[PDB]
Design a protein around this ligand. Structure first.
Ligand SMILES: Nc1ncnc2c1ncn2[C@@H]1O[C@H](COP(=O)(O)OP(=O)(O)O)[C@@H](O)[C@H]1O
Ligand SMILES: Nc1ncnc2c1ncn2[C@@H]1O[C@H](COP(=O)(O)OP(=O)(O)O)[C@@H](O)[C@H]1O
Ligand SMILES: Nc1ncnc2c1ncn2[C@@H]1O[C@H](COP(=O)(O)OP(=O)(O)O)[C@@H](O)[C@H]1O
Ligand code: ALF
Ligand code: ALF
Ligand code: ALF
Ligand SMILES: [Mg+2]
Ligand SMILES: [Mg+2]
Ligand SMILES: [Mg+2]
Ligand SMILES: [Zn+2]
Ligand SMILES: [Zn+2]
Ligand SMILES: [Zn+2]
Ligand SMILES: [Zn+2]
Lengths: 334, 367, 366, 367, 367
DNA sequence: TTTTTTCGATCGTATGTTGTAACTATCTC
DNA sequence: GAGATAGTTACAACATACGATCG
């Protein structure tokens, strides 16, 4: 949780509202992963819970600040999924709702933070509606998500929505160059893969994900001339399958764009691979493979407990089957 | 203390509720004629005032003056209900009380006389969230309860409720508020609140409300917060990301002529400018619909599009109706699955590629 | 840091401090208790983010001032395990704390004191002191009507109202109401507050009939009670409470005066055949005549006849026998006065001797 | 004002609508003396299960004797009518489903009835009982005391164990016909002295499916909305269903490929401010009715008589393939309506799509 | 009066029980030769004679004359056991009392010698409902039983019992009663009761019994009630039609033979009884899938679907596979498009019509 | 020489452990 | 010969383990 500079302007607005007392009791922040919305929410909560703040900065020495640093403030309830799980249950939401009834122990404001609104189940989202609609006095909520359209309409309508705009591409590239040392094409490719969100590309570079991407690219380069896509299984069967499927979809889309003729592509560091992919496949086949890859990624991310190995094996077998002549390709439908 | 416009402007009388004329008329007639039922179920979309209607009905039932369709709003019972501390009004959040034990405890207290009011009102919010056993337990008492208890049900998913419950309730369907009604309410609220505004901003907010008044109020509050305390047309346009210019016309023309480079360059420029993709898709769908309707009859074109009329006419002369239908359907499908795509830009590009195939540091306190 | 104390004095304050602490702490800090040796005393405080219990024990033996945290369960086990008369010494050696429990040396982990969430600055909106007997009487006479678990969260507590020179306690659950009042001899501003049921139970268990007075302070969001060398702090419901005056019936005309013992015996005898699930009874009131009837699902009937002083018109009214028995038990008076208006209205109960306490029961309409 | 449903519960076998077979079987059993000790009733909601169960219980315990025509005036009949008879143990299985409750119930079944000749246990919502509760009743059902009778009512008999189903005589109640519901509503309204019209009764009977309680609830709602009277316009407004004439005219215009007429009628409907989803549903229903008429002449009932002949004309001229194409096109249009930019735009585009692919008169192509 | 037909005709001698020849012969031989096990366990379906055979064995195990397979039926012990009030015969309904305390007391009671019988027999019925601790106590008591104590167990789900208890007792499994034996028993009972009957009615009742004599007797009693003291073909056929709940197979059979009026009649009959349309559609899909798999291999049809084995086998034999595949595909499409249909019933009727007299046009890869 | 499962939310039954109140028995006034 | 205190038994509340149904 680092404070990126580009978050400074938006913060300056939000806190100002809370300085005038005309602050909404339910703020929903929309931002891509790695943008730093969590840092903004933490700063806002820290300012709210400070007993005697000056300007836009918490004092850092009052009881509230000391407890926040210790992380044992009686207020500041936090909702997050269990360590072993990946969803937020109704029990935690109901417990927080029950606890909110009583007065504030420190006599200040009560802050509730939801780690990620998209992880809430249907029951939890429905339960939180009444609490969000008419919260007690001096109660503040903070929700974070990357796609508000996924949330329930009833839940969305009860929150004031604030959107964070990613910075300019040139500024992000310069910041990444100052941070990490890599080729310009690699930086551009990482930034575009992260939907132009600096911080996510930095995280991608920090881990071994770049080596996995290179291995996947080499495997695809070997596989495309041969027509044996099954070999890609070893490069895709992993806990981070959605990211690799996203990379494959990006490669296919870049190949299709090159086939149609374009100047801007996502994969800037591998012109040879995209050119070879475009040469060896028809645009219709590329479209079909892209659609299947996206559908499989969505199914993998949505369904819980689904076995990834079987799904990926079936996907690869279907991809190999499509390339045969005289086969009905799929068509999107409602 | 300060309260948002959504909750502060909750209607307090039958004269402060916009629309829903049939429901209000039915309630008034029932109260006047004395034909009082013991099971009312308000169903409809969200942000239309089901809970407000239920609260007003409960207030009217338990008014000191008597059973009237126009609550005074000043007697002890009315103000007590407004403050939410009235004893005989039991507001049950069904979304957090789904267990059978709570319902059984509730139904064991129905035989006691009301404390101070003449009726014991149970207002169940979001009754669709209860379990099956809860519904079955309710059924018996709800069929024929005592004479001093009334049940009020509010929900937005009537399909969830079993047919058995629906067969023993008076159902009232709330319609979605029209754009004109929402605009009128918004301007009235802003005038009462002493906030500057312009007609275009109110029209845009009403159109974007999608028939929900709560959404309209939330958007108005967002604009006020980000509009430096003023509801300006420019501020609302910037917040909503309206296309304004004729970008959609250029994109649809490029798609129709099947020029991949042009459409890709336009999409790249739009992404650099940072526009909303949903608005772009809606604008393109509207343009396709207008082109088709004009192709039906030359005079169908509206007067607001004169500045771009001529170009559109050419499309209506060069594109068969079937191709227009195909493009509209493809754009609609792309809009439907836009959220599920890994990126919004990727979804838009995929939809356009599908369509192209158709052709003959100051850190405050954070680590 | 270093201090040696006899086991007898140390035992019991530690039990009280560990009382509020449960098996599941859910946080490393909340599991431990804060021990502070200052001047010539030792203060042990324990909190669970809802209620705080702090005990103070004067120490005469030489000691080193300090303030740290120690696990509650380990300290309780150490103090309980030792035989009678053992002298316990404790010393903070660096990161660890060494306890010379008899002839066995034990090591305990120590956490920083600055991370303990305990109140430091207290502001009292009202403050006073009164003998423990009055508080015990009020709580005992008003708690039985308090709700246990209901949708209306504001009814799950007890209402304390300092009015003029007197203190009033109100409890209700939507079916019956109990009101008590007593003077204290001190002028106080009009102020009403709600205390949660758990805090009321803890306060009631705290009292033991000692002659030492009890000091009560009420702040913006908290209530503190000091008795002897123990301080108990709790938070408030903060949900508003309906006024009891409107609940009481207005202008009751029918009055029945009867003997408390006779009514108790009659109700107890009639309750034998009363329905177990509902426990409903019927009362017929006529000139100097009270007929009590009870029925059972298997048509088992019980009847009782009582002679009272009544002059009104004939009436028939249903009731729940359990509430009436509870009211009679809590009243503890020789004569009982019941005021009623009609067959569908609430009925008030008190003692003819005095009107200090009153109760209201809502009839069971059938 | 006591609601119509509670007021008009049948009190004799002559006051029950339909259900001839079960009534005849019960009458024959009571007359011949061959009386079983376990009866189960099944059927859809609001068809008279509890009503006939109570009537049978009253017939068994009547003072005059055991007859299929209870007097309805003796003390036992009056008490059972008022729902306070001591020998009619009514149990709400939905509220009490734990095994210990069943154990307590069965522990005291040996005692003789207090006043009646039989001690009748009437359990409602049997399917809510737990498995242990079901098992605990097997021996008692098989060999109960001579002075004990069990009556069971449930909506889904398939949830019960097969063992219980083999121990009791099963009676299945059928959904009431439209004519029976209309006649019952007419009789009730005549008894209540309320103005009514044949069209309103027909619409209410159609909208009540087969449950008479739903019909009574709808009638009460219509009376409340109509201000003490039942009128065809009031019923139409309550149901929010447009008259068949407009939909039939629109379908005819679409079939003949008259774009201008279709657009004018759509504009007129928009001026009327009708619901678009209801319009699409009505058009689909009309197409389905035409297809079924093509399947067999008798598929059309008298409810469409007002337009029957005209509708029949469409049956003998449109080939089945065209009907199927139109039905599928409208179904697809309704499927994609929610994502359209506007409901009006969605319906207009669906109609344009239908016209463009018209089998006989497609729109002209460009040149 | 007349008691109950099932309860009255409980067998009282080994010569009266019909069927189950192997169990009776084994028990008779064991009693004659003195080979008596320490514990028996009777298993089978409902209403086959488990309790009756257990009671007969108990009666024959304590007769005054001696241990024999043909008890006299006249001595004191036989008479008392018939009356169900014998001192030594301790019959316990395990379903009503499952807690450890009751079983503990009953098993501790074994330490006393029998009063007036050579054996003290315990007849535990519905043993599968006992608690785990109850099973432990029973196993502890049953490991080393006394010589004068015997245990008889009757159960319908033996798999619930632990393996340890199963290993300590000899298990006898009963089979279905078959049509002919049930028909003969019904004929004998009706002849004894002096009630008129027809052979076809008895055949229909036996067929509907489905291997359960208790069900056959219950249906016979219900038919007698409906037939006004007699059994007739028309009355029984009407009763079965009212109770018939196999509309899915009938609909499939009517559709496969290209009949329209029959399909409409079946749809109306299904609509008369409260039924979920989607449930019917999925049932039809399952039936078609089963028929296809039976066509692929004759062993696909298991023993579960024994009631409709003949008709399904005939359909598989006669219908070519291609028609089955087409019907499956069209009904799958109908199920997919059902939720968007104007009405559930109308959607089902449209899908049935499409499967009956239509053929979809496959995309047929053109490139 | 072995190998072998989706998850969340809700309902029901049986057994074991702990705390508080009421009744009975014993000792001292 | 009666009243007060202490010990034992019974009832209610809370916690743990196992089995079953629907989305
Ligand atoms: N008909 C209406 N007229 C005026 N305001 C309305 C209306 N319907 C809803 N609102 C506004 O929406 C807010 C929330 O409405 P709510 O009670 O949640 O309705 P629902 O229960 O249908 O969501 C209210 O504070 C009110 O200001
Ligand atoms: N056969 C019938 N004849 C007359 N009224 C009926 C009949 N069946 C149902 N009703 C009406 O339906 C309402 C409710 O019936 P109810 O007793 O709930 O049946 P069920 O137990 O099947 O739900 C009653 O008010 C009654 O008038
Ligand atoms: N073999 C048989 N012969 C005659 N009657 C039988 C036979 N089997 C069952 N019955 C009938 O079934 C009833 C007894 O049920 P039973 O079969 O003992 O229950 P279960 O077998 O389910 O324990 C009696 O009324 C009896 O007439
Ligand atoms: F409170 Al609502 F739809 F009833 F948001
Ligand atoms: F009371 Al019902 F079906 F609703 F029997
Ligand atoms: F009598 Al059974 F299963 F019906 F034992
Ligand atoms: Mg609401
Ligand atoms: Mg009923
Ligand atoms: Mg049996
Ligand atoms: Zn601070
Ligand atoms: Zn009023
Ligand atoms: Zn009678
Ligand atoms: Zn014998």
């Amino acid at each position: 949780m680092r404070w990126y500079p580009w978050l400074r302007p938006d913060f300056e607005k939000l806190v100002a509202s809370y300085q005038a007392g005309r602050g909404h009791h339910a703020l929903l922040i929309q931002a891509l992963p790695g943008m730093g919305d969590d840092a903004l929410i933490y700063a806002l909560s820290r300012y709210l819970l400070c007993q005697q703040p000056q300007g836009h900065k918490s004092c850092g020495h009052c009881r509230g600040c000391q407890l926040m640093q210790a992380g044992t403030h009686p207020d500041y309830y936090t909702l997050a999924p269990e360590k072993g799980k990946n969803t937020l249950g109704v029990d935690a939401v109901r417990e927080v709702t029950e606890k909110l009834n009583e007065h504030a122990r420190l006599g200040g404001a009560k802050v509730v933070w939801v780690t990620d609104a998209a992880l809430l189940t249907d029951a939890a989202a429905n339960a939180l509606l009444k609490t969000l609609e008419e919260p007690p006095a001096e109660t503040w909520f903070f929700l974070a998500t990357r796609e508000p359209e996924r949330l329930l309409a009833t839940l969305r309508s009860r929150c004031r929505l604030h959107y964070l705009a990613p910075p300019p591409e040139q500024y992000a590239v310069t910041w990444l160059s100052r941070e990490v040392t890599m080729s310009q094409d690699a930086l551009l490719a990482a930034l575009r893969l992260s939907a132009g969100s600096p911080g996510a590309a930095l995280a991608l570079f920090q881990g071994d994900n770049w080596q996995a991407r290179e291995t996947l690219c080499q495997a695809l380069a070997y596989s495309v001339p041969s027509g044996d896509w099954y070999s890609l299984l070893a490069a895709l069967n992993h806990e981070q399958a959605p990211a690799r499927l996203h990379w494959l979809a990006t490669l296919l889309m870049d190949a299709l764009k090159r086939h149609h003729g374009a100047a801007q592509v996502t994969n800037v560091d591998v012109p040879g691979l995209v050119a070879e992919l475009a040469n060896h496949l028809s645009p219709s086949r590329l479209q079909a493979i892209l659609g299947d890859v996206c559908h499989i990624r969505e199914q993998l991310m949505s369904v819980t407990g689904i076995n990834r190995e079987l799904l990926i094996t079936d996907l690869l077998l279907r991809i190999e089957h499509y390339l045969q002549p005289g086969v009905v390709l799929p068509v999107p439908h409602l | 203390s300060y309260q948002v416009l959504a909750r502060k402007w909750r209607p307090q009388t039958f004269a402060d509720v916009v629309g829903q004329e049939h429901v209000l008329t039915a309630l008034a007639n029932g109260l006047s004629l004395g034909r009082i039922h013991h099971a009312y179920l308000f169903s409809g979309t969200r942000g239309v005032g089901k809970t407000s209607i239920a609260r007003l009905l409960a207030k009217g039932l338990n008014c000191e003056t008597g059973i009237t369709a126009t609550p005074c709003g000043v007697c002890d019972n009315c103000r007590e209900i407004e403050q939410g501390r009235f004893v005989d009004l039991i507001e049950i959040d069904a979304a957090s009380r789904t267990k059978v034990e709570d319902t059984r405890d509730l139904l064991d207290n129905v035989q006691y006389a009301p404390a101070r009011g003449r009726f014991k009102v149970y207002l169940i919010d979001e009754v669709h969230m209860l379990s099956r056993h809860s519904f079955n337990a309710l059924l018996k008492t709800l069929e024929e309860p005592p004479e001093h208890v009334k049940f009020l049900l509010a929900t937005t998913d009537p399909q969830k409720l079993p047919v058995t419950i629906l067969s023993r309730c008076l159902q009232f369907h709330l319609k979605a508020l029209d754009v004109e009604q929402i605009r009128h309410q918004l301007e009235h609220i802003l005038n009462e609140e002493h906030i500057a505004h312009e007609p275009r901003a109110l029209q845009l907010l009403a159109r974007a409300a999608e028939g929900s008044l709560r959404d309209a109020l939330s958007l108005t509050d967002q604009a006020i917060a980000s509009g430096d305390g003023q509801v300006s047309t420019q501020a609302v346009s910037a917040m909503l990301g309206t296309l304004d210019d004729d970008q959609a016309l250029s994109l649809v023309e490029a798609m129709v002529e099947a020029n991949g480079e042009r459409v890709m360059a336009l999409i790249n420029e739009a992404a650099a400018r940072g526009i909303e993709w949903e608005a772009l898709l809606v604008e393109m769908l509207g343009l396709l619909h207008r082109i088709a309707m004009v192709q039906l009859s030359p005079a169908a074109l509206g007067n607001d599009m004169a500045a771009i009329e001529l170009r559109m006419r050419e499309l209506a002369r060069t594109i068969p109706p079937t191709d227009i239908q195909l493009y509209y359907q493809t754009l609609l499908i792309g809009r439907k699955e836009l959220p599920y795509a890994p990126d919004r830009r990727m979804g838009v590009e995929m939809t356009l590629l599908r369509a192209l195939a158709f052709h003959p540091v100051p850190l405050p306190e954070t680590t | 840091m270093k201090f040696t104390v006899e086991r007898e004095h140390l035992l019991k304050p530690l039990q009280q401090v560990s009382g509020p602490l449960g098996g599941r702490p859910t946080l490393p800090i909340l599991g431990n208790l804060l021990l502070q040796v200052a001047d010539g005393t030792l203060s042990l405080t324990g909190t669970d983010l809802e209620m705080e219990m702090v005990a103070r024990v004067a120490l005469v033996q030489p000691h080193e001032p300090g303030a740290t945290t120690v696990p509650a369960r380990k300290f309780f086990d150490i103090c309980r395990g030792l035989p009678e008369g053992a002298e316990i010494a404790v010393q903070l050696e660096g990161e660890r704390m060494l306890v010379r429990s008899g002839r066995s040396r034990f090591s305990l982990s120590t956490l920083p004191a600055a991370d303990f969430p305990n109140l430091d600055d207290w502001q009292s909106e009202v403050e006073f002191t009164l003998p423990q007997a009055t508080m015990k009487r009020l709580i005992e006479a008003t708690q039985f009507s308090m709700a246990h678990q209901d949708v209306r969260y504001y009814l799950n507590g007890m209402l304390f109202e300092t009015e003029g020179e007197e203190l009033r306690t109100v409890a209700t659950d939507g079916h019956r109401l109990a009101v008590c009042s007593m003077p204290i001899g001190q002028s106080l501003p009009s102020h009403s507050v709600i205390v949660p049921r758990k805090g009321v139970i803890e306060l009631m268990r705290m009292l033991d009939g000692g002659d030492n007075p009890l000091r009560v302070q009420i702040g913006s969001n908290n209530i503190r009670a000091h008795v002897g060398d123990f301080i108990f702090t709790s938070k408030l419901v903060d949900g508003r409470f309906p006024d009891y005056r409107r609940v009481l019936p207005k202008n009751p005309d029918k009055h029945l005066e009867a003997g408390c013992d006779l009514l108790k015996q009659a109700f107890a005898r009639a309750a034998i055949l009363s329905n177990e699930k509902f426990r409903g009874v019927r009362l017929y009131v006529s000139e100097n005549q009270l007929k009590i009837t009870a029925n059972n699902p298997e048509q088992e009937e019980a009847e009782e006849i009582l002679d009272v002083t009544y002059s009104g018109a004939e009436m028939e009214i249903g009731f729940n026998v359990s509430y009436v028995l509870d009211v009679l038990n809590a009243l503890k008076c020789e004569n009982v006065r019941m005021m009623l208006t009609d067959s569908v209205s609430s009925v008030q109960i008190e003692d003819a001797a005095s009107q200090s306490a009153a109760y209201v029961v809502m009839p069971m309409r059938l």
